[PDB]
């Protein structure tokens, strides 16, 4: 039983009646060590332990508010606990739920485009103002080692040069999810599709979210065009250039996230190296 699992057991004890007990806390699948299934006498809970070393990256109070603010959209699953002290989310467990991946997401544009419209047109004022270039600096501060990626100064300066272009185009400010990996979509056995894991949610340009959806599921040009056709409306305008720019910023940011996570003891192999190289590729294609 890990330290993280012991802390989870303690936090869940507050959700139980005098009779009930925590039976087990086990690590769920996935890339990171954040996700756990907790079993109690009469209840199962999905747990995301996101707080470890992320105090300066994920503003826990911002995100606790964002949960209660976003609840009536009906997109996320039910929350039972959001622990500010350690950064731990305790949610409902949906039995026999299907987690989406790139292939399955591509069959469900009829559901997913309206979902993204719902969030981007919510008119909700989330706590948090996403600043991608400040985000880069946050990771740079937290990382102890000499940056392990090749040709970093030239790449960094090219990435930071995109700030001026974004200012010229004009950056929009809407409620965004910020982390549209396909595995953040889960389907109930009865058919309802959820969008989960809003830990990064913030006010941002909606083209960030589109870039993330497209990049994280490796959409083809045909899939991008088809999705944009579905998603585009007067209240959800589309900018292809912004999408291209945000893809580069995402690969940069998540490559730095990788270094920091590995410094804390995780092993993601060449995940970060490859994302960084894709930023390099994107910079060349953009220019
Ligand atoms: N309410 C739920 N019921 C069943 N599985 C879930 C639930 N919420 C999250 N999960 C799973 O846990 C993962 C959450 O972390 P992530 O892998 O980053 O999406 C999802 O991919 C789902 O597979």
Residue numbers in the entry: -2 to 284
Question: Which lines from the publication concern this structure?
Answer:
Afterwards, the choline kinase LicA phosphorylates choline in the cytoplasm to form phosphocholine, which is further activated into CDP-choline by the phosphocholine cytidylyl transferase LicC. Therefore, the choline kinase LicA is crucial due to its role in initiating phosphorylcholine metabolism pathway. Here we determined the crystal structures of apo-form LicA at 1.94 Å (apo-LicA) and two complex forms with choline (LicA-choline) and AMP/MES (LicA-AMP-MES) at 2.01 Å and 1.45 Å, respectively. The structure of LicA adopts a protein kinase-like fold which comprises of an N-terminal domain (residues 1–92) and a C-terminal domain (residues 93–283).
In the complex structure of LicA-choline, a molecule of choline is located at the active site of the C-terminal domain, whereas in the complex structure of LicA-AMP-MES, an AMP molecule and an MES molecule occupy the active site. The MES molecule, which should be introduced from the crystallization buffer, occupies the corresponding position of choline in LicA-choline, whereas the AMP molecule is stabilized by the N-terminal domain. The morpholine ring of MES is stabilized by residues Tyr197, Glu213, Trp251, Trp254 and Tyr268, whereas the sulfonic acid moiety forms hydrogen bonds with Gln31, Lys45 and Asp176. The adenine ring of AMP makes hydrophobic interactions with residues Ile43, Tyr90 and I183, and also forms hydrogen bonds with the main chains of Glu89 and Ile91. The ribose moiety makes hydrogen bonds with the side chain of Thr96 and the main chain of Glu180, respectively, whereas the α-phosphate moiety interacts with Asn32, Asn181 and Asp194. The Fo-Fc omit map at 3 σ revealed poor density of the ribose-phosphate moiety of AMP, as reflected by its low occupancy. The similar binding patterns suggest that AMP and MES in LicA-AMP-MES might mimic the native products ADP and phosphocholine, respectively. Moreover, in the structure of LicA-AMP-MES, only Asp176 stabilizes the sulfonic acid moiety of MES, with Thr29 on the P-loop flipping away from the active-site pocket. Similar to hCKα2, the N-terminal domain of LicA-AMP-MES rotates approximately 18° towards the C-terminal domain comparing to apo-LicA by the program DynDom, making N- and C-terminal domains much closer to each other. The P-loop in LicA-choline is close to the active site and the residue Thr29 of P-loop interacts with choline, whereas the P-loop in LicA-AMP-MES is far away from the active site and adopts a conformation similar to that in apo-LicA structure.
